[PDB]
Write a protein that binds this ligand. Structure first.
Ligand SMILES: Nc1ncnc2c1ncn2[C@@H]1O[C@H](COP(=O)(O)OP(=O)(O)O)[C@@H](O)[C@H]1O
Ligand SMILES: [Mg+2]
Ligand SMILES: [Mg+2]
Length: 296
């Protein structure tokens, strides 16, 4: 799905007649939504597809129920859209978190005290998040990893049936079986996780040199807390293993080798993710990357 500035203003006016829009510009794109900065202070998200609308609905709900529970600012829900045939949530408007992404580059050019404070503040944020009680959240917010693996396996076997040689598809089937047979991916204490926890969602106040917010809870779910560390670990694009180690220890994690193992698994698994989502949407260049990584 695609939007003009006019369509965006029209959707909003339709449910918020008195809200007069003075300025509008595009703040960012993501995997699910286009984000619009409206009147300087609000960020509106419009969904590009069915799945993104579904995630936007869950974002709104999760953000409302963890409002004011966390030690870092997070977006607050101010405006809400509505259902549309195939879209659960037509748009949502949030408070804008001030600041700039704490990029790997930015982090490494900070002095060591601030670097270390940052690791501490991230650890504390994740410790609080992972400590929120999950008894009240519905079934759909829980992630069944076994179900995900098994459904991905079937999607891979259909999609690649004519791309891969027999022995290669055998190796793919082996890879999945090994994941399923290894209990380390399923035997965890589930909690609320961010599930997209990376440097571009970590906003930074470069005047105080401290982290001043966390954004994008679109993927937030009940799942494995180790995933919030793994997503920061990739050498380029994200932070080093050295810096996440600092976070893990502030967090008081007792099994960093397991986090490392899980990371290594997700690193291989990403190629299949690219194949599935490369087809499932429209980018045949994400499809071709994954396929090339498998054949490598
Ligand atoms: N509440 C917010 N405060 C400040 N900036 C935001 C906010 N929401 C979104 N943005 C900007 O819009 C971009 C896309 O938002 P995001 O929620 O990450 O999209 P997606 O859910 O599609 O991944 C972000 O990278 C950020 O630059
Ligand atoms: Mg994002
Ligand atoms: Mg998202």
């Amino acid at each position: 799905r695609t939007y003009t500035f006019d369509q965006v203003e029209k959707a909003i006016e339709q449910l918020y007649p008195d809200f007069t829009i003075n300025t509008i510009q595009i703040s960012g794109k993501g995997n699910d939504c286009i984000a619009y900065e409206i009147n300087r202070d609000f960020i509106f998200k419009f969904p590009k597809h069915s799945r993104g609308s579904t995630n936007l609905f869950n974002e709104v709900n999760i953000l409302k129920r963890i409002h004011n529970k966390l030690p870092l600012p997070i977006p607050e829900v101010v405006f809400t859209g509505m259902p549309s045939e195939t879209y659960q949530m037509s748009f949502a408007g949030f408070t804008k978190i001030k600041g700039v992404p704490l990029t790997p580059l930015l982090l490494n050019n900070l002095p060591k005290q601030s670097q270390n404070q940052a690791a501490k503040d991230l650890a504390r944020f994740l410790s609080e998040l992972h400590s929120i009680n999950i008894s009240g959240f519905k079934s759909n917010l829980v992630l069944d990893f076994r179900e995900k693996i098994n459904e991905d396996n079937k999607k891979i076997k259909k999609l690649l049936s004519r791309e891969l040689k027999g022995p290669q598809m055998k190796k793919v089937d082996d890879f999945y079986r090994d994941i399923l047979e290894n209990e380390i991916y399923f035997k965890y204490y589930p909690c609320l996780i961010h599930n997209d926890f990376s440097s571009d969602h970590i906003l930074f106040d470069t005047e105080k040199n401290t982290i001043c917010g966390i954004i994008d809870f679109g993927d937030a779910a009940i799942s494995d807390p180790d995933n919030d560390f793994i997503s920061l670990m990739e050498d380029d694009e994200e932070y080093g293993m050295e810096f996440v180690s600092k976070i893990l220890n502030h967090y008081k994690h007792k099994d960093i080798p397991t986090v490392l193992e899980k990371y290594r698994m997700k690193e291989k698994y990403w190629s299949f993710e690219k194949i599935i989502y490369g087809k499932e949407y429209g980018y045949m260049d994400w499809y071709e990357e994954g396929l090339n990584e498998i054949r490598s």
